[PDB]
Amino acid sequence: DRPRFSFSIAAREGKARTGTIEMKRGVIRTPAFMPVGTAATVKAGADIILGNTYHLMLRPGAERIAKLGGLHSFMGWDRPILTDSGGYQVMSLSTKQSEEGVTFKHMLSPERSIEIQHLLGSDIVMAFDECTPYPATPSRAASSMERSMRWAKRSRDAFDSRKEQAENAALFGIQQGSVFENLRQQSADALAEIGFDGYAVGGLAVGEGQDEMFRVLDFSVPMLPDDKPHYLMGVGKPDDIVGAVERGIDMFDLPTRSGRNGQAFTWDGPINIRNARFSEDLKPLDSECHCAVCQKWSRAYIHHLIRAGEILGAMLMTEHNIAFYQQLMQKIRDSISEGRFSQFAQDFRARYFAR
Amino acid sequence: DRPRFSFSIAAREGKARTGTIEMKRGVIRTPAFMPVGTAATVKAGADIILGNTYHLMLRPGAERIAKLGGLHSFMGWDRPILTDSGGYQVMSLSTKQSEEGVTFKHMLSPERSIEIQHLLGSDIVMAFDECTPYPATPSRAASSMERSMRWAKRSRDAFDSRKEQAENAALFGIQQGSVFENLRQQSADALAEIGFDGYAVGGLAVGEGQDEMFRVLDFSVPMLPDDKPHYLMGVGKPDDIVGAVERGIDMFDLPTRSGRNGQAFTWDGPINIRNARFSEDLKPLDSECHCAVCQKWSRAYIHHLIRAGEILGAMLMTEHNIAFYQQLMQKIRDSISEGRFSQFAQDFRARYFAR
Ligand SMILES: COc1ccc(CCc2c3nc[nH]c3cc3c(=O)[nH]c(N)nc23)cc1
Ligand SMILES: COc1ccc(CCc2c3nc[nH]c3cc3c(=O)[nH]c(N)nc23)cc1
Ligand SMILES: [Zn+2]
Ligand SMILES: [Zn+2]
16 A cells, blocks of 8 residues: 655756655655646546635535545545645635634634644645735744744644544645745744655745745745655746746646636637637647647637636636646656756747747 | 438327437437537537527627538537527517518528528528417417418528528428417418428417416427427426427427526426535435436535535536436437336326425
């Protein structure tokens, strides 16, 4: 049987890595994109899907999901599932913060977050953190990061207390520190002292823009343990993914939101399929994409469906977008393994931004 | 190669018939349900799908559909397609009527309706008729039916003038006459004198209710040629279909509308999946249904998706509903062929209405 958790790096190019995470429910090829499980009928394709902790804890509630057999049974997905810890979502969508946790309209603490994720049955559990708002002053970023590190220890202890969770799931710690190198270093040191199965870069994709995000990744990723997976939370567009892989990121969580609003991803950049220019375009959404939508239907027909208000149009767009992202990740993995990722990144950008 | 059109009756029970329509693009098993082609990725499953003449003539226009290669190429469907003549839809959704045709906000005549259906490339073409409003006085029903019969002759002549259409498609005439036996007879006589490949019962499913609809079918269907298919337009719920088959109907055009509004069809009657009673129900939508949704997911999960606003929920509901209707038609065909349709209809009603 597969181990609870084992990350192996098969090949490297610069800071980029490709490899595998083995878990009891399956193997995850990295760099990996992790789609939302409810977006479409995701097929095994993705190696791991996201569960929506924040939504599930409100409807139907984590206790009810456990009564129904856990998220794997509920969603019909027998492979790994990753869940976020819920605080990012509470702070973005719902609040009163304290050292105990976050109260909102009802108290979410590290201990409760870990128990919710246990009741959902997820395989990769995120520590309960605070995503510091951007911009943040050095003092506020430090105080926030320090609280997150105390919460990371409480998350570790709560996870270790639940035998089924400790023996079958994995726990990731989340680095904070805003855009400040010294705080990112203190956060990395604190997380490594606690010890986690993987390490996330939190506190980005919060409005800072790509140049600043890449600058922060430049110094932040090397601070994390090299032999553990690196998960960049909340990122992102295809070009953000490529640049983050170039900086040592292994896992990523737009393709669903875009698919419901008329935006399709292609190797020549995004297109808004509702635009009249596509009304007579017989080409598939993307000229090279191998997905079932591009094998069968034209831009003109998908344009027609979406303009007519047919839900089928949005579903076909979403299926194409998820498949496009998975083809992107496969090309990334293959190019790193083959030692041609630098060339791939250059070729990708030249075509994606030529439009 | 298959003929342009050939209807064969394989078995009968009372007024019910089962058989096949052969056309160049495929065989249609009857009694048949014909789903909307844009509702989901319909697989061959249905033998024939509906094209939406009224929508297509406005967006992108019939000329544009022809430029794109016709509806078969546009929709990715190589089997038969049926199109309505457009007047029902103009009168229900858009008007100024005259002997020439209907002007609306732009002139739809028998000749233009036939040419639109030619440009769309459909295989079964409906004559351009007037669906008389309900209720109608005898005088108004007569005047309306008489105009429809003049329009039926003009439709016949326009269809016969287009070589590609006359040689490769089929034309159905539409009986009118409201609820009046003498007018239904005059309409049937006029249509049979013109001569059509199939005959539709029009002017029903316009608010009259099931008892009255069945009463009209009781005398109206026997007036049509026995050796030609009988298409009841606009019907209907599963129980309407069963009772109409008992009265000699072979083809039918709710499952898509219901699927987008939370209603699922089951052998125990319809259910509204959004209701809280389904939040913990681990059974599939229907206990016997063989569709892909019922093989994989529970009522509880589909309830969750729809309540969360996920388009996936509505798509799974729609796929189940279309599959349910096709299983209904298969059971109807098998039971007629086996001489147990009367028993099937009795068993169906007892369970469907017990709920
Ligand atoms: C549906 O499943 C999931 C959905 C979203 C996410 C990412 C959410 C997210 C951020 N998003 C942008 N920046 C973020 C930053 C963070 C962050 O700093 N911490 C946490 N815990 N989450 C963040 C993870 C899983
Ligand atoms: C999308 O493709 C299609 C959609 C709807 C229909 C049926 C429309 C319809 C009626 N509906 C209820 N009563 C009707 C009655 C009629 C009728 O009397 N005549 C015509 N031409 N149509 C009718 C046919 C094809
Ligand atoms: Zn595609
Ligand atoms: Zn089903």
